[PDB]
């Protein structure tokens, strides 16, 4: 039951909604399934991101930066050139 | 001696068929049914939409051979 | 109607306790006749090596509560 969780900005809506549900799909899969490359994840947002509009297709650096971003956040644990979640904190 | 932990992780695809007048309850409580897939512990995303119970297949234009995503419980 | 494919997830950790005397064949034995896991059709890893059930515990020098993960069938 949820529906005003959205926000009103009349462009970055879309965007912000895309890139929570590709880390819906990401942060729930490492929530269990805590190791894959970043080719399985980026294969899997390709996918979701082709089947619909979603940001007319994203790119390596888009992908790539957003798990950059995550690991420069603390966000996602980088293990030997494989990645999954920090299910703890230290 | 000592002891050992061995993770058995499924990450998998399956197939299953469904009718596009069919309600999405019907494909949850299928994959549950068939698999023992849970459906609210376990929550799906076809082609980058969440499912809306009362809704079709054909609501969201289920064709054939297409992909869902079964996420477990996240939040 | 249109047949579908529903990606699963399902992850469980196993705690078993083994010898460094024996041989990896030994745990093969045992998951496949806890849970039925076939070694030919899911082969366990270790920190990134699979474990050849010829080898022995001690010849990979396996400690207490070490974690390792069964992938799907990939030699």
Do not use: H
């Not at chain 1, 590709?22 to 929530?31: P, R, S, V």
């Not at chain 1, 650096?61 to 957003?66: A, C, F, H, I, V």
């Not at chain 2, 799906?44 to 869902?68: C, M, P, V």
């Amino acid at each position: 039951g949820s529906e005003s969780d959205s926000g009103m900005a009349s462009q970055a809506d879309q965007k912000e909604e895309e890139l929570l549900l590709f880390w819906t799909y990401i942060q729930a899969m490492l929530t269990n399934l805590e190791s894959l490359s970043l080719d399985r994840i980026y294969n899997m947002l390709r996918m979701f991101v082709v089947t619909g509009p979603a940001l007319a297709e994203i790119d390596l650096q888009e992908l790539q930066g957003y798990l950059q971003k995550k690991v420069r956040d603390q966000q996602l644990v980088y293990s030997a050139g494989v990645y999954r979640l920090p299910k703890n904190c230290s | 001696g000592m002891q050992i932990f061995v993770d058995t992780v499924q990450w998998k695809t399956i197939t299953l068929e469904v009718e596009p007048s069919d309600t999405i309850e019907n494909v949850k409580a299928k994959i549950q049914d068939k698999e023992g897939i849970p459906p609210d512990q376990q929550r799906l995303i076809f082609a980058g939409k969440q499912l809306e119970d009362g809704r079709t297949l054909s609501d969201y234009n289920i064709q054939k051979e297409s992909a869902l995503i079964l996420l477990l419980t996240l939040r």
